[PDB]
Amino acid sequence: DVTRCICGFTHDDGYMICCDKCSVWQHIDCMGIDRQHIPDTYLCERCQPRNLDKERAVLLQRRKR
């Protein structure tokens, strides 16, 4: 029941994905996950470090509040 996305927003935007290791939920749009290409296994950006555009995530989520 924990949300921790790179955008920092805690609302549910209608399409989220759960880290298989730490169980936090993230918005697929923020994480650049294509709804047509959901992976079998998913790890968040802490459990599988990688670079993402945080500012893009924030601006996308602002208009979803």
Binding site: D12, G14, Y15, I17, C18, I38, Y42
Partner: peptide, 7 residues
């Protein structure tokens, strides 16, 4: 993966 699509 586990996802959720809240409507």
């Amino acid at each position: 993966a586990r996802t959720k699509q809240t409507a």
